[PDB]
Amino acid sequence: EPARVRCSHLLVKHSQSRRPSSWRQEQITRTQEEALELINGYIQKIKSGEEDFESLASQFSDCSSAKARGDLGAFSRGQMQKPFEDASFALRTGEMSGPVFTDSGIHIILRTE
């Protein structure tokens, strides 16, 4: 395992997220159920080729990393929330995760390095 990985992600928050606000919306109103529906629909569009991961993250991620087209930069273990970390380190470079759940919301992760 490398000391650090670089990943991009797309976060979809919901009304029970730790911080249910984002640069996209003053208050996150969608339900947890709707957030997972959106995540799964993004996964399906990326798998079909209809959408590009980082292009989608740049406009639809609730994380401020949307400004960097979803890029979080490099990180080691012990930094990110544990479910995010474990998913990220389990990816090969070029691989995308399925839904990943944290206190922040629901993510899809693309490992880039």
Q: Which residues are catalytic?
A: 9, 63, 81, 104, 107
CB 21, min distance to ligand GIA, A: 11
CB of 35 to ligand GIA, least distance (A): 8
* Residue number with CB closer to ligand GIA (60 or 89): 60
CA distance 55 to 57: 6
Q: How far is the CB of 82 from ligand GIA (least distance, A)?
A: 26
Q: Which is nearer to ligand GIA, 25 or 76 (CB)?
A: 25
Give residues in contact with ligand GIA (CB under 6 A): 24-25, 38, 60
Smaller CB separation from ligand GIA, 22 or 88:
22
Residue 19 CA to residue 41 CA, distance in Å, equals 23
| Alpha carbon distance 34, 79 (integer Å) | 28
What is the signed CA dihedral for 11, 12, 18, 21, rounded to 10 degrees? 100
SS percent in the chain: helix, strand, coil, step 5: 35, 25, 40
